[PDB]
Amino acid sequence: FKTTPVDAAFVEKQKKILSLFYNVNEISYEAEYYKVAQDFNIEASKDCYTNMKAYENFMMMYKVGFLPKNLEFSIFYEKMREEAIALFKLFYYAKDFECFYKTACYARVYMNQGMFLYAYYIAIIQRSDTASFVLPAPYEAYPQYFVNMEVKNKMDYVKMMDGCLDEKICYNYGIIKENEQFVMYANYSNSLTYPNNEDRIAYLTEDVGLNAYYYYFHSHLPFWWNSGKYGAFKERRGEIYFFFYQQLLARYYMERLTNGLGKIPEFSWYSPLRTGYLPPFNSFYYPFAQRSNDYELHTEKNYEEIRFLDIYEKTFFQYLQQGHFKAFDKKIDLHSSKAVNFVGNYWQTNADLFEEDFLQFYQRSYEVNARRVLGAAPKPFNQYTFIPSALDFYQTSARDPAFYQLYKRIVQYIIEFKQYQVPYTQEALHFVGLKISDVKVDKMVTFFDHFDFDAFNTVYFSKEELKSSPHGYKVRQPRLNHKPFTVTIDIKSDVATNAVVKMFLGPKYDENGFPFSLEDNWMNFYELDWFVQKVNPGQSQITRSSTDFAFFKEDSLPMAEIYKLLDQGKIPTDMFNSSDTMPSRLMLPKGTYDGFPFQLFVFVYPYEPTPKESEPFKAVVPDNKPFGYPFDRPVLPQYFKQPNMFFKKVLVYHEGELFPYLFNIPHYTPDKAQ
Amino acid sequence: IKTKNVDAVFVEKQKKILSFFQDVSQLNTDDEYYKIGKDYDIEMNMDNYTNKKAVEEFLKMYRTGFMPKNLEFSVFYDKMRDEAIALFHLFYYAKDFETFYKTACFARVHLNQGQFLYAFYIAVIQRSDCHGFVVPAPYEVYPKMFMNMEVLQKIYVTKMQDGLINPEAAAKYGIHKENDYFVYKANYSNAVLYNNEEQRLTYFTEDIGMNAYYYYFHSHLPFWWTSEKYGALKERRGEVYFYFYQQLLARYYFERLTNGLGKIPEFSWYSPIKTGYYPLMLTKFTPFAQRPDYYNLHTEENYERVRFLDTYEKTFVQFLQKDHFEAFGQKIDFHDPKAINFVGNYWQDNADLYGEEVTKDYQRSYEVFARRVLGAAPMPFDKYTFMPSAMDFYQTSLRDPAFYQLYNRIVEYIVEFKQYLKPYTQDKLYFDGVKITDVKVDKLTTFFENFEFDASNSVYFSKEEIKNNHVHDVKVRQPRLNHSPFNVNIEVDSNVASDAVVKIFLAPKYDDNGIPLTLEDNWMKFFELDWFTTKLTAGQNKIIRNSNEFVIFKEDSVPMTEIMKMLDEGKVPFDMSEEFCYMPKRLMLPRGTEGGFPFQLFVFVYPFDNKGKDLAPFESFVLDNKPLGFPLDRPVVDALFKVPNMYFKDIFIYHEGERFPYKFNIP
Ligand SMILES: *[C@@H]1O[C@H](CO)[C@@H](O[C@@H]2O[C@H](CO)[C@@H](O[C@@H]3O[C@H](CO[C@H]4O[C@H](CO)[C@@H](O)[C@H](O)[C@@H]4O)[C@@H](O)[C@H](O[C@H]4O[C@H](CO)[C@@H](O)[C@H](O)[C@@H]4O)[C@@H]3O)[C@H](O)[C@H]2NC(C)=O)[C@H](O)[C@H]1NC(C)=O
Ligand SMILES: *[C@@H]1O[C@H](CO)[C@@H](O[C@@H]2O[C@H](CO)[C@@H](O[C@@H]3O[C@H](CO[C@H]4O[C@H](CO)[C@@H](O)[C@H](O)[C@@H]4O)[C@@H](O)[C@H](O[C@H]4O[C@H](CO)[C@@H](O)[C@H](O)[C@@H]4O)[C@@H]3O)[C@H](O)[C@H]2NC(C)=O)[C@H](O)[C@H]1NC(C)=O
Ligand code: NA
Ligand code: NA
Ligand code: NA
């Protein structure tokens, strides 16, 4: 519930930014943004931009025309990408906030909804003056991607009937009036959307924050954008790539573990993919593409793409087999520091992997092609109209099990390369004159909580209604969550030093009930937190609350609540400092009444600062150390018995109901955690 | 246009009927049906039903619980089906109109609307007091199943917005307000998706008439109900089955030809199936299931289903291996053409296959499970919760290439039986001293024309809007195929005054390589257009027959509002009152080409049983007991067949105007 103060100039500018997220699916002919848009003469505005070549480029594509309103926009299709990147460059190179805003009002009014939102979200995140301003949560901007079609439909019907037929009847269908607004209860999906064991974890993969999280990841550093803005970070880009996915997959594999699901399965482009998924969405023209269980990847429609994909991976194998090779106009050694970066950019086909300021249409991307084949859609009708899968959007990608299958496949390939890195030696890890004597944690408890957000942006309003910037329509759904807990660390030091304290969470046992060995477990640990303590000689005890963990955040406030906070000169400080991290809700994987066993790994090493990175991301240790150190590479497990290391077995309990559905039953009062 | 007159008593009853097809998704609590419905007690009225056993069974089943109001009813699933059938029994065994009506009022009020409408539509058709009555075309009753989701969504958008926000902008999307209707132009699925060559045929396979047609076919004669009611017809049931598909399939094949698409594809349950279907339709819960190209039928989920299906076929193969056998308590001999009955009933697995009034769950349907596996949906969640596919409904079945591929398979097996039958001989077919000396046909020309249908039943209204009888009416318009009327002039030399039957068939000229088509192996590609009778005088005669008079087809259904107007004028539509279960007239010809696609017409004149008396159409067919499709109901031998009372005219189907339906829908 934490805030940050803000003056009137901010408030007024902020409000201007947010005003464009109102009733995104329509136009209020009475809005201020509409007057600005009408007043804006795009052909006479060359002087609004600091880059005339970008403006000229836009005006050219614009003279021929863009993606029409009402078609689905996706970053994964070439022409739409060029157009969206072009729009973004105008947003970005606008000289001023006033020029930025006029341009944004223009695009808001005259361009495809999805395109505009896409570029506007990114621009705000990216523009120097505009960063430090808050954005509505991805699910409040794009409800259509965060709301399964049962509810979305009920919403259509409720709006068409301007309320309920008879209030008791739609109490039974989970629809409520609460404070002049509607609330629809929403369950997670059937086996008619997840038609296999994967359904056990719908509550994770359909989770709105998880999905938001991935969308924020993309938006902070789009594959198509070079690193110029982040200077010295350019060097660490590929390294992020690995860390982001490795880390995400670890979090995901933990959920599997507590639902008895075991290892994410391998697959092949020459065989059928066992595990299907039926996205519960529809676009303007099309229901989303369904991928049934045992879907044949290898058919006529996909042959040429499979040829592409196969060689793409096999050339990585050739790079591993040589060790030094000239590739992409560089001479690159895989014992080199620069290697980690290369690898990452190679798999993502970055703008950085090439010359490029902005990615050339013609540089074929393994991720792009992978998502087309796994999405299982029919081939696009023309280049403005394609049949959407979940893999077509960062908002929806984490929903399809095939997503984790793809990125696990990538991560394994990079781990294959990671054999070329030099495993940390003993004195390397050994912190001289520093020992952790004990670690102690509070009770770790997961549980479920209803959570609300306003889905009004996917609901339609009348000419009259739009004047009021109407937003009646809320989705209440049980989401994972845990109680706050503290870790206390007992330390003995010879000397006063400065130390970094990192603590990770990972698995304890196989699916066979065997202890994981570190040589096989290191990729399965995810970072919870890091910080810097001045450490005194003698015995000390460091306490750390789950509330202060570096890698997690509070939920976003609805746009309504943001405005209510501006009215009293404030902003939600997590939405401010760190919108791009995992929600704290999802910090722990769902536990059991037993207590599910995991290891908390605590690690203390010497703090040796470097000049602050200017960061596209999660502020990471002001260190020359890698991301996710010391788990950034294969280990020699002997070297992990150091006195400044501590593995502590920890059990995650659960409380109240065991399944989200038990919360959305009309007339049943659930067991709520206390 | 073609009407009929009706007393004020019929009028009150007809309007009572139609009130159940008016706002189907919602309940008007002020309305008369609701007051009646809510408190009506079936138990207290037990003695007002012919069949106590039926009503008891209903009350039992109903107190147990029916399907819920929000789900999607399909007849192809056991429990839902049984509920439906029980409800139907209730409607059917009602003593009189009044009780039937009170029974509907109840069901509308208390039950799933899909279930109710399925039940009611059939009851209206099947009740004897209700013969002469009229049901609205299925596309008005279930409009959501006769349009792609693009359009449906546009409808919902416009309603949420309480109108058009920027008329000019909306016009770009084929939406405009016209008086007090909102009008949506609707494109066929291939305007937005061409996944395989089958999309070439969408204007046929999606045509709201063709689909409605199949829906009527089922409603008139459901697989689960006995043909008892129809007396003598019962012994012909199988015959009607084969005929219906063999005809439909022939008509379909014609469409195939004129789009350069050839013979209907064969599949194997042990193999993937090459032809996918991507339904662009949905339900309040879920989208219809998609079948990708090269969808593998043989996966874990289907292993048992395939076993059953494979066996069902192998079983018939065994029947073919004996010629005479005992099955289902009958003794069958395949040399006997009347065995067609058994054969048709075997494949449909209908009530008349056993001696029963309704089918039972343990009497497992080949067609049900074929549909289920071809449909590619994942396994249903529970009994009321499944992912619909186009083959879960008769309204939608024609939309899927797989439908034709299935019934093709079945029909073929049935002709494997037809090979047992002795070919009609020279002297069975001769009409002594009569000769068709010439056939001349007018211009055969197809075209498209915009058609509108009232799609209002798809719109949800407000408490306040319902009592205000506020109007938000919705029309969907799309180009539908039609053709110009034409005459067939037949010149015949009768030696002597005789009464004759004339029959007219349409057939292909060549296959898709230009091999001319021989009766020996193409007899089942003959599509019957007309059956009529004529006095034939001595010397030279000439019959002139107009395509409007062709007996096998019907005019378009009139909309409910138009029917509603006619009732105030003691009028009712003729075609809808009697002739509803026939193919719509506009579709009789396949889409021709601008330069004249070649078919041929087969005219056949044969001796009619005098009657010694004057003649009326319906019983005139039953007086001569020629098998359906005579003389092309069994294999022909060309040389043994041709005769002077036969004639084959090469003909050409032209198309005029705009060739592609999307060009009508252009902004
Ligand atoms: C049924 O299905 C059909 C076929 O898919 C649809 O027909 C398409 O309709 C769309 C309009 O919705 C057409 O696209 C638009 O039409 C114009 C095309 O002009 C032609 O001729 C000019 C020369 O005058 C050529 O330059 C050009 O190559 C075209 O061949 C354009 O005027 C439109 O531009 C407008 O919108 C764009 C964005 O789309 C803006 O950037 C512009 O400022 C301008 O406002 C647009 O390109 C399309 O041509 C039709 N397809 C075909 C094959 O004819 C129907 O819409 C559909 N019906 C329904 C109810 O859905
Ligand atoms: C999220 O998903 C969950 C899990 O599926 C849904 O929970 C189901 O919700 C429905 C309510 O929508 C429940 O159905 C109801 O069951 C009640 C309990 O009944 C017991 O006792 C009755 C006799 O009273 C027995 O017949 C029965 O066997 C049980 O022993 C009933 O009291 C309810 O009565 C209703 O019945 C008829 C419909 O047949 C109505 O017309 C009546 O008016 C009356 O409302 C009702 O049938 C079901 O139990 C829940 N499932 C589970 C597994 O717990 C949530 O609804 C869903 N939430 C959302 C928002 O989708
Ligand atoms: Na596509
Ligand atoms: Na997976
Ligand atoms: Na077939």
TrEMBL record, chain A:
Disulfide bonds join 48-99, 164-170. Keywords: Secreted, Storage protein. GO terms for cellular component: extracellular space. GO terms for molecular function: nutrient reservoir activity. It is found in: Secreted. SUPFAM superfamilies: Di-copper centre-containing domain, E set domains, Hemocyanin, N-terminal domain. Residues 10-131 form the Hemocyanin N-terminal domain. Residues 423-654 form the Hemocyanin C-terminal domain. InterPro entries: Di-copper_centre_dom_sf, Hemocyanin/hexamerin, Hemocyanin/hexamerin_mid_dom, Hemocyanin_C, Hemocyanin_C_sf, Hemocyanin_N, Hemocyanin_N_sf, Ig_E-set. Residues 137-413 form the Hemocyanin middle domain. Belongs to the hemocyanin family. This is Silkworm storage protein. It comes from Bombyx mori (Silk moth).
UniProtKB/TrEMBL annotation, chain B:
Residues 423-655 form the Hemocyanin C-terminal domain. GO terms for cellular component: extracellular space. GO terms for molecular function: nutrient reservoir activity. It comes from the Eukaryota. Transmembrane segments: none annotated. It is found in: Secreted. Residues 10-132 form the Hemocyanin N-terminal domain. InterPro entries: Di-copper_centre_dom_sf, Hemocyanin/hexamerin, Hemocyanin/hexamerin_mid_dom, Hemocyanin_C, Hemocyanin_C_sf, Hemocyanin_N, Hemocyanin_N_sf, Ig_E-set. Keywords: Secreted, Signal, Storage protein. SUPFAM superfamilies: Di-copper centre-containing domain, E set domains, Hemocyanin, N-terminal domain. Residues 137-413 form the Hemocyanin middle domain. This is Arylphorin. It comes from Bombyx mori.
